[PDB]
Amino acid sequence: YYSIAPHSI
């Protein structure tokens, strides 16, 4: 299941 990255670097 793919995981969202909530905030960019």
Next chain:
Amino acid sequence: GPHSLRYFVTAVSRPGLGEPRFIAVGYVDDTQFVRFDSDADNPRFEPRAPWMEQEGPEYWEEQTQRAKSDEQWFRVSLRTAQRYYNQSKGGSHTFQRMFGCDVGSDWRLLRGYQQFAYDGRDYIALNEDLKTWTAADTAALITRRKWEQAGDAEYYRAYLEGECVEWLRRYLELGNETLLRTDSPKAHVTYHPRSQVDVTLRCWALGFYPADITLTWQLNGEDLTQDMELVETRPAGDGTFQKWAAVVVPLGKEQNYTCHVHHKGLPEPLTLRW
């Protein structure tokens, strides 16, 4: 168990050619099962293992939108990284994500992963405590501060303990006919003339799964991992893996060299000679 779920996500900026390339692949142990390719004819999350073709359309729809969201994340992060390091806007750059979870004998979380890389080097990574971050340089310290203030470690930890681990069990049941197997390596030593003074002994390992294996040459107990050629473990293409290790030995002294194979499918490590 144990078992592992991993996603390997890559974005490559292409200035003057168009939007960044974006590709994500999913692995259960050493078996790929899903992919998203921004350069495909119809970019969409799709199965790459036969035991995934029985999922409903809402699985692929939700996974596709998550992948499309992450693609925008990579576009922003690539531009932000370019700015952080004050690099030219005309160069191609790479950003990589590597995340997933390990389950064990009883099928619960051993370790979660949230790793990030810029141009092939460590950038930031979630520590094993699933609470703190390790930044690779001072630019990544900016990122870490920002993610610490927002508490994103709790967002990732909730995924690692929830979705990552529960869906890994579901995958392990859908492909229980193939994923839980353990193929022992078929190993042997071959002989190849080299010169008038020495000869090449090549020790093969074939048809094994999973991919992790150890090949070692020894000369009368003492070990030879300095002097030997050892190629990377390679896929056969049918779901098993191969590897070999070779050593140059003087003529007439082949029987003094032994090859040792360690593998999860091997009750006792094999020791072979020519």
Next chain:
Amino acid sequence: AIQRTPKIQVYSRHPAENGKSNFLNCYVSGFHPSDIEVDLLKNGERIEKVEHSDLSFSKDWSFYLLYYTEFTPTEKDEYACRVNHVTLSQPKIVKWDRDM
């Protein structure tokens, strides 16, 4: 900024027997950046029906790919893999050797 030279392996899926269909593999691994040219050659000519795995990478972030094609080996047919990468000054041709 950093560069990793690809390691190239050419081999068949099953032990080579003349007359029976097989698969010819060219495995490129441990390279960076990801742009790479890989072609399989039959007697020096590019094979068209070549498939390749989806781009993935290892724990050290280095990429790897597997190009493969169906072929029926003979005693005279020469096979090889041609790889070009920014780390290589010119394309590297690795011939298929039944013992490697």
